[PDB]
Amino acid sequence: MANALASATCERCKGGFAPAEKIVNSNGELYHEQCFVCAQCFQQFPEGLFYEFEGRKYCEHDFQMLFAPC
Ligand SMILES: [Zn+2]
Numbered sequence: 001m002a003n004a005l006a007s008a009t010c011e012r013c014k015g016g017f018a019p020a021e022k023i024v025n026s027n028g029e030l031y032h033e034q035c036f037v038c039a040q041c042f043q044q045f046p047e048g049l050f051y052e053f054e055g056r057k058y059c060e061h062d063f064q065m066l067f068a069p070c
């Protein structure tokens, strides 16, 4: 259906992933265990999870400035 889809690839990297180790979903987008970047400073970050959000992701950098304890 729709146009010819290629495959499941990362968002800020488009890396063809699949395993729960390389594939990581949050909000609705797909990320790697080390692609999570700051929608503002684009600062990537390991762990595979930080202050991400729907349609927008952020690292503990811009978000620690806003100061959001938990
Ligand atoms: Zn990636």
Ligand SMILES: [Zn+2]
Residues within 6 Å of the ligand: 037, 038, 039, 040, 041, 042, 043, 058, 059, 060, 061, 062, 063
């Ligand atoms: Zn940042």
